[PDB]
Design a binder for this molecule. Structure first.
Ligand SMILES: CC(C)c1ccc(C(=O)Nc2cc(CN3CCN(C)CC3)cc(C(F)(F)F)c2)cc1C#Cc1cnc2cnccn12
Ligand SMILES: CC(C)c1ccc(C(=O)Nc2cc(CN3CCN(C)CC3)cc(C(F)(F)F)c2)cc1C#Cc1cnc2cnccn12
Lengths: 300, 285
């Protein structure tokens, strides 16, 4: 990656999207960005971008994590993955710049919609083929990550972003959001794990693989067909979810699965169940999941 | 963990037929041996049920396994080593609270079976104590109503959750997606609009449940309003333009008790009373 800062002077401030312990997040406009970034430009208006601004008196520890995040993000270039557009690091304050997804994270997007009813034909609605199109984009992005030997480790709707025309980009917001605190279980010090999205081997042995990403995709797809109305295993405690992973290990018929979402076709629930195969090698690859869902989306 | 011995469950009568099993009333042969008569309710899964039904069965076991309170239904044991699968709870002889109150009339000493007003408050206090237990477990019931409360001897109440496995109360549920149905007449406005189920929305349902008890279960909430009008009414709570309607004061209900129900139906969830306060009011104040 070239060591050339994005020009701060090309970031017109529009709105503060969030504030946190070590800085703020701003929404900005960049006029005629073709000379600065290379993109599949969305439809002569300025390009919206998100900017995380590290606080100017950030600790060395915070700066180090900031730099490492830039490094991880710099290698990700795919239509269904969030894109690092640039950074400002040669002076304070440290800035990183991504593309902007106007509809926010996928959990809040689907929480505001209802499934369209064909035997009842007044908030916004979404069709079942469109839910399949969303899931197919997620699988497409995860497929790309798999080709990089990149294990996401925290796939869930809360880490998927929604742009125009239902475009989905996978992201990772860490633990910078109090909204989803209930989705994480504290194991050691400040480290937390999203156990309800994690495969049994992740919970019991800490084995995070592409195959465990497939397990998380099954839960994420479950969220999408639930329109994010309920936490996975919502009426079970964290300890009980951890027990459930031990029953996948025990393998004597006591493990439990997420139920088939209302109106979810049996074939799609069967796809989820293969993602939750006890043996990681029996879980479908993301290329198969993408192919299944992309065809199912067009044949529905 | 060892299973419950199947042979000790001696059959008395079938309490219900289900799409994936049956419910039996049973006597435990020798209750003193297993203590380390005695009637129990037993749900039998079909030996031909789908794996989905079996999965939903085991999850219900898990949920119920952690419920230990005098006013909550209690799982006594399970039979899961073989087919058919069985779960076992204590038995409440007087059925659910809706059928109990509907069979009674309010006692009037200044003038069928009767029930006093202090006993009605004792019933409602027991419900509030059980819900306080669930709240300490961060457990959101989501379907609180008299139809899900059971009556034993000495007017003891235990909260349960029968799902939608009874045709009796179909009118109390509104279909939203596939097989998913919602008890909108007991649901807070934020539940109907945004699907936000909290303990504070359980408090809203408690207000409606307390309305039921003081009505002696003679009328469905908003009975002359359609489901759509109830949903529209949720929208008027959101708008807060003064057009939202409330359940009327039950006949012979003191205005102070009705004022408590109104506080349970506050637009702001954070302004609704906690179950500990509702319990001490109904049991003492
Ligand atoms: C605020 C803006 C500038 C922003 C910054 C970063 C990210 C992001 O995802 N970094 C990421 C990091 C990492 C590796 N680690 C993950 C967690 N660990 C703790 C250390 C690092 C992996 C991956 C993934 F997943 F790609 F591999 C992505 C996203 C954004 C954004 C945004 C945005 C766009 N549109 C909206 C609308 N509303 C709100 C926010 N928006
Ligand atoms: C037939 C017997 C064996 C029986 C089984 C279960 C229950 C019960 O409630 N499980 C429950 C489940 C749940 C979570 N679920 C899982 C998901 N699901 C979609 C909704 C809820 C929550 C809770 C609560 F509320 F505690 F949190 C209670 C009750 C019984 C019984 C009985 C009984 C006793 N006495 C009589 C007299 N007549 C008829 C029946 N009787």
């Amino acid at each position: 990656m070239p060591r050339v800062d994005f020009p701060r002077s090309r970031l017109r401030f529009k709105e503060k999207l969030g504030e946190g312990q070590f800085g703020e997040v701003h929404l900005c406009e960049v006029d005629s960005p073709q000379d600065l970034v290379s993109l599949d430009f969305p439809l002569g208006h300025p390009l919206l971008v998100a900017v995380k601004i590290l606080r100017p008196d950030a600790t060395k520890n915070a700066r180090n994590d900031f730099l490492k995040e830039v490094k991880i993000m710099s290698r990700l270039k795919d239509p269904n993955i969030i894109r690092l557009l640039g950074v400002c690091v040669q002076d304070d304050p440290l800035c990183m710049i991504t593309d902007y997804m106007e509809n926010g994270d996928l959990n809040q997007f689907l929480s505001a919609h209802q499934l369209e009813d064909k035997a009842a034909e007044q908030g916004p609605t979404i069709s079942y083929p469109m839910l399949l199109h969303v899931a197919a984009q997620i699988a497409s992005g995860m497929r790309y990550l798999a080709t990089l030997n990149f294990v996401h480790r925290d796939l869930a709707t809360r880490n998927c972003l929604v742009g125009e025309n239902f475009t989905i980009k996978i992201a990772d917001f860490g633990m910078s959001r109090n909204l989803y605190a209930g989705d994480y279980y504290r194991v050691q010090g400040r480290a937390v794990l999203p156990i309800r999205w994690m495969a049994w081997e992740c919970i019991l042995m800490g084995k995070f693989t592409t195959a465990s990403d497939v397990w998380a995709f099954g839960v994420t797809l479950w969220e999408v067909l639930m329109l994010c109305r309920a936490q996975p295993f919502g009426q079970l405690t964290d300890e009980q979810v951890i027990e459930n992973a031990g029953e996948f290990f025990r393998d004597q018929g006591r493990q439990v699965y997420l139920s088939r979402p209302p109106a979810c076709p049996q074939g799609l629930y069967e796809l989820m169940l293969r993602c939750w195969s006890r043996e990681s090698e029996q879980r479908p690859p993301f290329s198969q999941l993408h192919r299944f869902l992309a065809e199912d989306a067009l044949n529905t």
